[PDB]
């Protein structure tokens, strides 16, 4: 308890965010801790089977493309001689067609068989306090207007840092640590293009994310002792997962971040926020976890504005995947098992990650 925040006088320490240590070490620590938390859970090599899928019991409209498929297939029992014909529900982002008739297979069977996370373990972040070993010290820059590089005139030594929640979010970093008075932008070189601009603002904007179906999980026994948690029936209506952000608070925080970002590009410049340019689905869209389920929520409803030199809510839709490929390794997955009931999580967006456009041609 009571970690000794010890102030020092007359000290000018040269901090650097971008060539820092403690971040590649933290990244290797969190991916190795991810790897060690999957070894005792089961392996899903007997599931790469030719699935026969169909459409879910639903009024199929042609414009709305259904994110659920109803797939039935053979699977071994714990008795090796016998097999059972079982059925489950999958998302369309997890199966692929094999070529009339329709036959599907999983998305990863020609790359890597992979592991269902055994659901006694959970995925919410708990705070980790990093500590220095004996014979080392940890310095903390207590300055307020500190953009992240150079001298800091008020440092303080700490034995063990404060609560760091490891969240995995791609854009719109959630549950972060707020600023003190302003909204702070920071960059390694702001006149560069390839370096992201990290934005952290003072008062958070809360975000309410949900999926409103109640999945009923079922246990399909693969073999002796190994069970596979599939999606059974959807009772009630099927709907799309979404997230809500307060419109007035989002417009106010974008006004604050424009008022801050005009200090680096002249005051008479027209700042225009556009949506993401393209790429894989884990970067074009806001990816996060919520109660042990992985959301991929569209983001074009927020980053769409044009700012000139002078109780409603934004609903943004989501798609959810069961097979992840986090950290982008070569032979890994994680089959996240489904969660019973509807899912709701409330969090507080504290920051953003932006990227300029590499403009030529007289651009104002």
């Amino acid at each position, epitope marked *: 308890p009571n970690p000794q925040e010890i102030h020092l006088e007359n000290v000018t320490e040269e901090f650097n965010m971008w060539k820092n240590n403690m971040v590649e070490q933290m990244h290797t620590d969190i991916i190795s801790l991810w790897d060690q938390s999957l070894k005792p859970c089961v392996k899903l090599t007997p599931l790469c089977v030719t699935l026969q899928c169909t459409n879910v*019991t*639903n*009024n199929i*409209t042609d*414009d*709305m493309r259904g994110e659920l498929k109803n797939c039935s297939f053979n699977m071994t029992t714990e008795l090796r001689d016998k097999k059972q014909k079982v059925y489950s529900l999958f998302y369309r982002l997890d199966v692929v067609q094999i070529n009339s008739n329709k036959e599907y297979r999983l998305i990863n069977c020609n790359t890597s068989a992979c592991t269902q996370a055994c659901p006694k373990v959970s995925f919410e972040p708990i705070p980790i306090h990093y500590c220095a070993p004996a014979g080392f010290a940890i310095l903390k820059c207590k300055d307020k207007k500190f953009n992240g590089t150079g001298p800091c005139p008020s440092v303080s030594t700490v034995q063990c840092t404060h609560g760091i929640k490891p969240v995995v979010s791609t854009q719109l970093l959630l549950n972060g640590s707020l600023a003190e008075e302003e909204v702070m932008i920071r960059s390694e070189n702001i006149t560069n293009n390839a370096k992201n601009i990290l934005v952290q603002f003072n008062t958070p904007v809360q975000i309410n994310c949900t999926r*409103p179906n109640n999945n009923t999980r079922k246990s399909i026994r693969i073999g002796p002792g190994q069970a596979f948690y599939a999606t059974g029936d959807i*009772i*009630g*209506d*099927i*709907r*799309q997962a*979404h997230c809500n952000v307060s419109k007035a608070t989002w417009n106010e925080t974008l006004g604050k971040v424009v008022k801050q970002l005009r200090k680096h590009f002249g005051n008479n410049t027209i700042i225009r926020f556009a949506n993401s340019s393209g790429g894989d689905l884990e970067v074009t869209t806001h990816s996060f976890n919520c109660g042990g389920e992985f959301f991929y929520c569209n983001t074009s409803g927020l980053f769409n504005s044009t700012w000139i030199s002078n109780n409603d809510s934004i*609903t943004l*839709p989501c798609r959810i995947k069961q097979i992840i490929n986090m950290w982008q390794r070569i032979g890994q997955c994680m089959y996240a098992p489904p969660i019973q009931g509807v899912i709701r999580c409330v969090s507080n967006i504290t920051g953003l990650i932006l990227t300029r456009d590499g403009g030529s041609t007289n651009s104002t």
Partner: antibody
Amino acid sequence: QVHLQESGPGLVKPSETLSLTCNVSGTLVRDNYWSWIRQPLGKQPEWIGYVHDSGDTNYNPSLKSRVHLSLDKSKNLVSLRLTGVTAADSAIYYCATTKHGRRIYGVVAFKEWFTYFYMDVWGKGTSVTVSS
Amino acid sequence: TFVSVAPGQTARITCGEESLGSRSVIWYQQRPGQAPSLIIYNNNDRPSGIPDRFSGSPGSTFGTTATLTITSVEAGDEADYYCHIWDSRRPTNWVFGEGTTLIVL
């Protein structure tokens, strides 16, 4: 005050196009949606279709080609044209008004709702039958 | 599918397949010989001219048959009833529910 008047042949020979008209009272035809209701003897009635101006003329997909509905702006009527009289359509017929209404069960912008109908007032029916 | 209760008592006349999603049923009456007549045009509200004693089950319950509850039955209720159901998962029904009539003593 509304009351409707169905009018048709009643006795139809097979392989002929059945036609039927519906005279109106009280209000005219254009300002609301109209519907045709079939009922064979001693069972559930089935709904044939519903009409309105500006393309709101969906039919029973079981029939979908064997029947064409139409409007009478000039005489203030609404008509039915059936094609290929079988033995099954020997039934009582009804022209009847209908009112729409939206059942909303989710996010409104995600097209997560539907439109249910209901026939409020009815005519008297016409027992059309086929003979040989 | 006939049901007969003594006059003055209550009756629960049921119709339709089990519920899958949210639904907005409607309920129709057919006195013998004449045209039909609307009774309930949503789950649980009725048009004017149609009296009370015509209560219905709500639509929000999942996995539940479409029923119609009458109290204080009389001789005017001797007619045919019909459900016409609009499930938000199964497609639209161009034919009514099964004819389940009701006679009184």
